[PDB]
Amino acid sequence: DSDIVESYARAAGPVHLRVRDIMDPPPGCKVVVNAANEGLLAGSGVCGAIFANATPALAADCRRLAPCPTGEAVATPGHGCGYTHIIHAVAPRRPRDPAALEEGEALLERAYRSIVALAAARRWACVACPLLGAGVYGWSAAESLRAALAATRTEPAERVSLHICHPDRATLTHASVLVPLEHH
Numbered sequence: 001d002s003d004i005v006e007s008y009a010r011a012a013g014p015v016h017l018r019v020r021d022i023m024d025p026p027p028g029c030k031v032v033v034n035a036a037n038e039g040l041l042a043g044s045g046v047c048g049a050i051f052a053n054a055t056p057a058l059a060a061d062c063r064r065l066a067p068c069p070t071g072e073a074v075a076t077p078g079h080g081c082g083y084t085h086i087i088h089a090v091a092p093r094r095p096r097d098p099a100a101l102e103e104g105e106a107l108l109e110r111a112y113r114s115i116v117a118l119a120a121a122r123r124w125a126c127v128a129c130p131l132l133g134a135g136v137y138g139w140s141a142a143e144s145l146r147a148a149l150a151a152t153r154t155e156p157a158e159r160v161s162l163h164i165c166h167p168d169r170a171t172l173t174h175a176s177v178l179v180p181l182e183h184h
Contacts, residue, residue, distance in 0.1 A: 001016075003018045003019040003020050004016050004017065004018055004019075005017040005019060005172045005173055006176045008152075010149065010153055011152060011153050011154065011155040012116045012151075012154065012155070012156050012159065012160050012161075013125075013152070013159040013160045013162070014162075015148060015149060015161070015162045015164060016161070016163045016164065017164050018163055018164060018166075018172075019168070019172055020165050020166075020167060021049075021165065021167045022046050022049065022050075022128060022129075022130050022166075023050070023081070023082055024165075025083060025128055026126070026128050026163040026165065028126045029083070029127060029128040029163050030083055030084045030085070030124070030126075031083055031084060031085045031087060031119065031122075031124045032050065032078070032081070032083040032085075032087070032127070032128045032129075033073075033086070033087045033088075033089055033115055033127060033128065033129040033130060033132070034046065034047055034086050034087065034088045034089065035047055035089070035091060035130050035137075036068060036088035036090050037090060038066070038067045038069065038070060039062075039066050040065060040067070040068055040074075040088055041059075041066075043136070044135070045130075045135040045136060046135065050086060051081075053080065053081040053082060054078065054079040054080055054081040055079040055080055057077075058076060058077075058078075058081070058086070061076040061077065061079075062088070065088075068088055068089075068090050070090045070091070070092050070107055070111075071090065071092065071107045071114060072089075072110075073087050073088060073089035073090070073111065073114040073115050073118050074087075074088050075087050075088070075118060083128070085122075085124070087115050087118055087119065087127065089111045089112075089114060089115050089132060091107075091108055091111045091132040091133035091137050091139070091144075092104045092108055092111075092133065093137045093138055094133065094137060094138035094139045108132065108133055108139065108143070108144065108147040109147045109150050109151045110151070111132050111133075111147075111151075112132065112147055113154055115127065115129065115151075115162075116152065116154070116156050116160045116162070117156055117157075119160040120156040120157045120158040120159075120160050121158075123158055124160065125158075125159065125160065125161060127160060127161070127162055128163045128165055129148070129162050129163065129164050129165065130164070130165060130166065131144035131148075131164060131166055131175075132144055132148070133147075134166075140178075141166065141171050141172065141174065141175040142174070142175040142178035142179055142182075145175045145176070145179055146179050146182065148162060148164060149179065
């Protein structure tokens, strides 16, 4: 646990900020979150990496399940990507000029809430998660962390610990400063 930048106490469960690749499962996490699109298609970034390490059966399962509305999540087996299961969660694209922005912050928080509720219902206690929306969808690492740390205040039926993974140390330490700074 030397990769942990910070650990936050939240109603859902501890949120750990971890310097590691999403494809390098944290100890105890058998379940990973895909930063997915509404069509559940392979993309770049995290979604690319998960699909890169899986069988075609994953695309087949997504064909059966698509679309996943923005703000929602849906599960599939992991099909050899290194995790037993994948939680495909769809973050909104960041609105370019409000008032869609406040609407989009709520939808980003909702995506995280959807992950937690889904994991709780499957009794998955630990989930490895990227910073939803912090790639091509345009959100910053701090916006995505703030959203996760807001979403996890909603108490779930069963505790779920989010291990948030990003391979770049500076991105995470920077984010860990901006979150409290907003409130300062």
